[PDB]
Design an enzyme around this catalytic site. Structure first.
Site: not given
Ligand code: KIE
Ligand code: MG
Ligand code: ZN
Length: 313
Positions: A68, A72, A106-107, A217, A269
């Site tokens: 983050h 990104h 956004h982050d 995102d 994944q």
């Molecule tokens: C349910 C698991 N999870 C949320 C997750 N997220 C992402 S991106 C992401 C980042 C922050 C979030 F709060 C949500 C999603 C992924 N990219 C590859 N595998 C992944 N698993």
């Molecule tokens: Mg975010």
């Molecule tokens: Zn983001």
């Protein structure tokens, strides 16, 4: 104003494609963003001096976390730029302006922890913002930075347009709370199939931009496999640190955040691609057919993770 930003040939070309990777050279990322604003909006939409100052304060307020981070921010903005550029006529002047800025911001001031972790830790942000905790913070950092001397890129907008653009940006940033994505996509899917989807309905536009924001995102899943695979490393580095921090609060973290359960990543994944990624880009492709390459690339990466499980890599 006759000062057209220009990228090297390879980047000038590939930046138009959904799967473009912005590269390891941090000092070209502002220039890439400005290029995209000029092509996506106009050299007129923002005062170069203010825009550069705004960009460099946003970079300053991104932290040195594995995922983050500032890279990104600029990756999510590039994905929006490709969507916007493939759907020229679908979007208002105020939309084109606000959405690239929303994606960059956004982050803002992300700490590398989920809304969950903040709430269990009892972080003050969790007391200030009961839901979409980090996302309300990101919007607040965006408004704070717009209010810095020499940073109001929206200075030429009327009172009206200014409130409109900040409201686009607020909804766009809130939509990046994945907890809200599931319902947004369900409604969008229902709406599209019963043929009630109406881009003149402001409330409908909001939902469609929400989904765009999810798609931008989540765009690491729409890159070439070596990008997808190396970005997953960065994502899990943050999750596993969170998992460690949960264990320090005496809370067994979900397996996705447990580094002891690294073995289960490939299967993890698959679920993510099946439950989030594939539905997101499908509904998007149905609403905005020229975004089909995101769905195609996403399906290609699902296929690479299936291969990782089959020990074919
Ligand atoms: C349910 C698991 N999870 C949320 C997750 N997220 C992402 S991106 C992401 C980042 C922050 C979030 F709060 C949500 C999603 C992924 N990219 C590859 N595998 C992944 N698993
Ligand atoms: Mg975010
Ligand atoms: Zn983001």
């Amino acid at each position: 104003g006759l000062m057209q930003f220009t990228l090297p040939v390879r980047l000038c070309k590939e930046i138009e494609l959904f799967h473009f990777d912005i590269g390891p050279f941090e000092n070209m990322w502002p220039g890439i963003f400005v290029y995209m604003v000029h092509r996506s909006c106009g050299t007129s939409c923002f005062e170069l001096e203010k825009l550069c100052r705004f960009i460099m304060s946003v970079k300053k307020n991104y932290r040195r976390v594995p995922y983050h981070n500032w890279k990104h921010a600029v990756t999510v903005a590039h994905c929006m730029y490709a969507i916007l550029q493939n759907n020229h006529t679908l979007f208002t002047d105020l939309e084109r302006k606000g959405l690239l800025i929303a994606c960059l911001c956004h982050d803002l001031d992300h700490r590398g922890f989920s809304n969950s972790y903040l709430q269990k830790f009892d972080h003050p942000l969790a007391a200030l913002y009961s839901t979409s905790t980090m996302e309300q913070h990101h919007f607040s950092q965006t408004v704070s930075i717009l209010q810095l001397e020499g940073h109001n890129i929206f200075s030429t907008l009327s009172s009206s347009e200014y409130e409109q653009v900040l409201e686009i940006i607020r909804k766009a940033i809130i939509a990046t709370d994945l907890a809200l994505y599931f319902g947004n996509r369900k409604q969008l899917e229902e709406m599209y199939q019963t043929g009630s989807l109406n881009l003149n309905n402001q409330s409908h536009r909001d939902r469609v931009i929400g989904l765009m924001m999810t798609a931008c995102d989540l765009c690491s899943v729409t890159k070439l496999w070596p990008v997808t695979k190396l970005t997953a490393n960065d994502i899990y580095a943050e999750f596993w640190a969170e998992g460690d921090e949960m264990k320090k609060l005496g809370i067994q973290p979900i397996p996705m955040m447990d580094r002891d359960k690294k073995d289960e990543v490939p299967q993890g994944q698959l679920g993510f691609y099946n439950a989030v990624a594939i539905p997101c880009y499908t509904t998007l492709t149905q609403i905005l057919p020229p975004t089909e390459p995101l769905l195609k690339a996403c399906r290609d990466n699902l296929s690479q993770w299936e291969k990782v499980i089959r020990g074919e890599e």
